[PDB]
Scaffold this active site. Structure first.
Site, PDB file in Angstrom:
ATOM      1  N   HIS A   1       0.835  -1.229   0.000  1.00  0.00           N
ATOM      2  CA  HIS A   1       0.000   0.000   0.000  1.00  0.00           C
ATOM      3  C   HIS A   1       0.855   1.258   0.000  1.00  0.00           C
ATOM      4  O   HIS A   1       0.260   2.331  -0.026  1.00  0.00           O
ATOM      5  CB  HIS A   1      -1.100   0.002   1.066  1.00  0.00           C
ATOM      6  CG  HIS A   1      -0.607   0.033   2.474  1.00  0.00           C
ATOM      7  ND1 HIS A   1      -0.478  -1.120   3.226  1.00  0.00           N
ATOM      8  CD2 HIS A   1      -0.283   1.064   3.283  1.00  0.00           C
ATOM      9  CE1 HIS A   1      -0.073  -0.791   4.452  1.00  0.00           C
ATOM     10  NE2 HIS A   1       0.048   0.546   4.508  1.00  0.00           N
TER      11      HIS A   1
ATOM     12  N   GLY B   1       3.128   5.764  10.029  1.00  0.00           N
ATOM     13  CA  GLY B   1       4.545   5.754   9.649  1.00  0.00           C
ATOM     14  C   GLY B   1       5.209   4.451  10.028  1.00  0.00           C
ATOM     15  O   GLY B   1       6.347   4.237   9.602  1.00  0.00           O
TER      16      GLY B   1
ATOM     17  N   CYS C   1       4.177   1.314   9.379  1.00  0.00           N
ATOM     18  CA  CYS C   1       3.992   0.212   8.402  1.00  0.00           C
ATOM     19  C   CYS C   1       5.364  -0.228   7.846  1.00  0.00           C
ATOM     20  O   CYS C   1       6.224   0.642   7.609  1.00  0.00           O
ATOM     21  CB  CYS C   1       3.058   0.638   7.276  1.00  0.00           C
ATOM     22  SG  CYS C   1       1.345   0.521   7.854  1.00  0.00           S
TER      23      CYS C   1
END
Ligand code: I70
Ligand code: I70
Ligand code: CL
EC number: 3.4.19.12
Lengths: 306, 306
Positions: free
Chosen positions: B41, B143, B145
């Site tokens: 993503h 932030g 991920c």
């Protein structure tokens, strides 16, 4: 979201850990530049430990008596001195992985990360607080001596703790990196009393702010209190006095949540007087006091290092 | 003595963390050899996330669209592919700090260390368990991920978790390093139900053994139970069934303490039926289920790595 007991990343300290052996005693050392720092009781047999004369013992030691190993590699010792309760072993090789570092003397109520080591190899990392009675609630077995406590500010390792000894009920005592003990302890295996521990009030309030930030709001009441009235109630529950310095330090969390420190103090007073009635805050049935205001901000704002 | 929630030393993983940016989305990547692994993503805008067509989005991306940074140094991307929910970015530089590593798919009830990162920089390290409903109770902000979960067996990093998303009540979901989600989740911002969580019975028993090893013995009763009778009682309290495999795995702690697993099961049954009456075990007012039998042994025997 979420709130966990979080340690500093340990990579910068891992590169500094070595094994120090002198006869049958092995423990851990910290290799910075061309110096290895370790607890001075490395030069003791088990019997020596009951009433050691560290000077008489170090007098009989030559440089070669210290076997220092960084992984496989033996590091040759070329000098040795005693500073308070730590041995400094000068080695013929400067550590290429030495980070930027400082030696700091931390204050009671402040937190740090411990890198637990055995035979100069890292085992695990965890966060703990310097208790008001100058002990820490660690996890340390035989072989862990010389394990260090640290904080990281962007690129700089601040070393604050070196592990020496265990006190009644699995509490731990040690030195700064100048070998001065935290608290009234000496490196002798003889009866010594720790002062009674207290609860770190400013840290419990920091953790209640963390709870609110995470949406755990049930304990917020509609009241306020004065600093003096708060301190009278908490003194009964063995909480340390809250100071204006503490109120000022809680400023960032107070501003983020819109909850005045004295309003949060009224909510803590009600928890102390009435208990939690089987409810949890951030998953805990007890009030947590080992997160500083800076730890809550850091964790709730994503402050990074390196 | 002492018992703490302990993470693996993170040094070997710190050396692998990078920043990945594609337009306005920045998150973390894992740099191993000449591949960077990150959540797919990264190629989404905020709106895309409601119902992303990852293939249509990746089709419009060229290698140069991926800005990969290891500290200051930009790493040039020379290839890109999607495997399930992770992007693999081939880079023109192999990571010199790549450790020995494996990709593993962990089982529910097993623990691992999370290295929480922002903008490719480590923030902190903590231990967590894969819950029976395939979530973890983490600490993850925007932030985070691409932050990974791992275990260390002497020299080998076993990567098991990459962070993708947050579910209701600050619980977290992500993938293995082949990009297959743990549990029934998809990387879309739309309603998805987690199954109800259960208590990891074998881990609570491991932690009661840790308590005994540490001298916290008050909860040991004079009784035994059958496996079947234990399971009937615990099912009521939303504990997972204890299996003979679990009894066998608790063997080392049982042998160390001289307490049969079925005797410890009788002591747990009494805690579940009667509660703790305001007493603590290892400092906790609740039963802990995020230490595995191997974590207790490791911590109570001083197992090291590197
Ligand atoms: C350290 O030497 C090592 N090799 O790891 C060791 C660490 C201990 C062992 C158990 N858990 C630990 O943290 N430190 C010691 O053995 C020190 C050392 C000798 C005794 N000692 C102790 O920690 C003892 N404590 C003690 O005597 N406590 C009093 C009575 C002072 C409150 C003991 C009994 C071994 C835990 C010296 C020089 C202090
Ligand atoms: C990650 O993208 C990053 N940049 O850090 C981020 C991490 C999140 C943000 C808050 N805490 C975290 O762990 N992941 C996401 O934003 C993912 C991403 C888009 C939505 N998303 C979520 O985590 C959302 N969760 C969600 O929609 N949960 C459901 C309804 C499926 C149960 C949300 C609301 C932003 C927390 C995708 C592709 C899943
Ligand atoms: Cl608790």
């Amino acid at each position: 979201s979420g709130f966990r007991k979080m340690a500093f990343p340990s990579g910068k300290v891992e590169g500094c850990m070595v094994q120090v052996t002198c006869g049958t005693t092995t423990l851990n050392g910290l290799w910075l530049d061309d110096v290895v720092y370790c607890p001075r009781h490395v030069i003791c047999t088990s019997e020596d430990m009951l009433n050691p004369n560290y000077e008489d013992l170090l007098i009989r030691k030559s440089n070669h008596n210290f076997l220092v190993q960084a992984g496989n590699v033996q590091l040759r010792v070329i000098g040795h001195s005693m500073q308070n309760c730590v041995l400094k072993l000068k080695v013929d090789t400067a550590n290429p992985k030495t980070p930027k570092y400082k030696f700091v003397r931390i204050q009671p109520g402040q937190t740090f990360s411990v890198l637990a080591c055995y035979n100069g190899s890292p085992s695990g990392v965890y966060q703990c607080a310097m208790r008001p009675n100058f002990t820490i609630k660690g996890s340390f077995l035989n072989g862990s001596c010389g394990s260090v406590g640290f904080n990281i500010d962007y690129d700089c390792v601040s070393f604050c703790y070196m592990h020496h000894m265990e006190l009644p009920t699995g509490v731990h005592a040690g030195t700064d990196l100048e070998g001065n003990f935290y608290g009234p302890f000496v490196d002798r295996q003889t009866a010594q009393a720790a002062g009674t521990d207290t609860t770190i009030t400013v840290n419990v309030l920091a953790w209640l702010y963390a709870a609110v930030i995470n949406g755990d709001r049930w304990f917020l009441n509609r009241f306020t209190t004065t600093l003096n009235d708060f301190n009278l109630v908490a003194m009964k529950y063995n909480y340390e006095p809250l100071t204006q310095d503490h109120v000022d330090i809680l400023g960032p969390l107070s501003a983020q949540t819109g909850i005045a420190v004295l309003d949060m103090c009224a909510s803590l007073k009600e928890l102390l007087q009435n208990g939690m009635n089987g409810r949890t805050i951030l998953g805990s049935a007890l009030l947590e006091d080992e997160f500083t205001p800076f730890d809550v901000v850091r964790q709730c704002s994503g402050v990074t290092f390196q």
